[PDB]
Amino acid sequence: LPKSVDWRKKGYVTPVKNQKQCGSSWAFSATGALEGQMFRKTGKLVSLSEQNLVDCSRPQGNQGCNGGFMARAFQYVKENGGLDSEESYPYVAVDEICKYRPENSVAQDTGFTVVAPGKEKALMKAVATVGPISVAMDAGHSSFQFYKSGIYFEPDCSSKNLDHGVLVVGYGFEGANSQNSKYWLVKNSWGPEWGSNGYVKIAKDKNNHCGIATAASYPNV
């Protein structure tokens, strides 16, 4: 595998978005993974509709602004036959009536692939070979809310109890040694202003920190 990967540098990632006051990180993580897969498939980067997911995926088990899961979102895209673009179905950060329009669909999936659980090595292979990957993590600490730069490492982080969906867009290391000070490049949905231009470097190969490899997946396009 490569020593480092950064899908942002290859055009697979949209600019950072902001979920605002709605517990929709699961939707942002899902559209991020679909955006990278549609880009790999067609060469066109199109921002997808998290609102489409928020308003319409209740049957698949999601709860809009009250929470959900990326796998349920990919299930909805598969069952629904499509997903609208953000331009056509804008994000408003509140639960609204489902307004899916098939004529406006710009993405599709036949289901999804799950990365072997808890395996950071399996996650690194998926990131290097597929593109950005949806992952769940434990973001429930003040150190994460206030993160600004460097490799994030929180001793109280759990690898089992997860509460926020994010997107792994790559991995790398600090310094000249490729085997130390390793990190996962993660795109968050708290706006460009949070963290490092909206991203966070999470410690890699340090016992699956914050559970990044615990429940990872990607849509099959």
Author numbering: 1 to 221
Q: What do the authors report?
A:
Addressing the elusive specificity of cysteine cathepsins, which in contrast to caspases and trypsin-like proteases lack strict specificity determining P1 pocket, calls for innovative approaches. Hence, we set out to determine the crystal structures of cathepsin complexes with representative peptides of cleaved substrates. As a working model, cathepsin V was chosen because of the resolution of diffracting crystals (up to 1.3 Å) and crystal packing with accessible active site cleft. Reactive site mutants C25A and C25S of cathepsin V were used in structural studies.
The MPD molecules were bound to the primed site region. The peptide LLKVAL was cleaved and bound to non-primed sites only when co-crystallized, whereas soaking yielded binding in the primed binding area. Of these, 26 bound to the active site in a substrate-like manner and several of them with a different binding geometry in each molecule in the asymmetric unit. Peptides from patterns I and IV bound to cathepsin V consistent with the observed protein cleavage sites, whereas the peptides from patterns II and III did not bind according to their cleavage site found in proteins.
